[PDB]
Ligand binder design. Structure first.
Ligand SMILES: [Ca+2]
Length: 223
């Protein structure tokens, strides 16, 4: 997250870190057995880390649980990142408590101008690199689909939206991928892609979760 603030420990209790020896992507806990992330985060060997603030220090609220199954969206296209969503089932149920909690799925899509909370452990610099240990947060509005499509001509689909600031300075960045965009208490987006970080006229692009709620609910009920 560039241009954000330190969330504070366990203030985003649905935020997960996906770990394969190291943090590599965020995700969101949607019930005690299932995490939502980005399909471009797919890999074998995932351990889901719940209850994290500093990802390099064991602070007392963590739960580390291996993934038992990953399910990339049937229509994920890695060239275009259309349908950039994946489900991860935990080998054992998380213990839900205040520090570890699920986030609700949308019942309908969110509108342009709605403010959302984006979080993660990605890079905090817009030119160089600096990776935080503690979780970072950013408040950002959903942008109009026309400004999104104007920023990235030929690349935005109906399964994507942009959020952030066309003037630059505030955005998601490398390492935030897969993490949550929560608006009015619902998981509306997943950190998906962009061009650079926090650059002018290049806002972040996010998977539009509301289009996937039926697939999510059917998939978890059958798995
Ligand atoms: Ca920790």
């Amino acid at each position: 997250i560039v241009g954000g603030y330190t969330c504070g420990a366990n203030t985003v209790p649905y935020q997960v870190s996906l770990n394969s020896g190291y943090h590599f992507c965020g995700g969101s806990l949607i019930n005690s057995q299932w995490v939502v992330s980005a399909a471009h985060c797919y890999k074998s060997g995932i351990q889901v880390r719940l209850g994290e603030d500093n990802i390099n220090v064991v602070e007392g609220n963590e739960q580390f649980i291996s993934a038992s199954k990953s399910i990339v969206h049937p229509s994920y296209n890695s060239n275009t990142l259309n349908n950039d969503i994946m489900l991860i089932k935990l080998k054992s149920a998380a213990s839900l408590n205040s520090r570890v909690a699920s986030i609700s799925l949308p019942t309908s899509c969110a509108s342009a101008g709605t403010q959302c909370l984006i979080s993660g452990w990605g890079n905090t610099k817009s030119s160089g690199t600096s990776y935080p240990d503690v979780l970072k947060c950013l408040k950002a509005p959903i942008l109009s689909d026309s400004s999104c499509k104007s920023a990235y001509p030929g690349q935005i689909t109906s399964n994507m939206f942009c959020a952030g600031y066309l003037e630059g300075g505030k955005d998601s960045c490398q390492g935030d991928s897969g993490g949550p965009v929560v608006c009015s208490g619902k998981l509306q987006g997943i950190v998906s892609w962009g061009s650079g970080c926090a650059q002018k006229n290049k806002p972040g692009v996010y998977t539009k979760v509301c289009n996937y709620v039926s697939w999510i609910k059917q998939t978890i009920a059958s798995n």
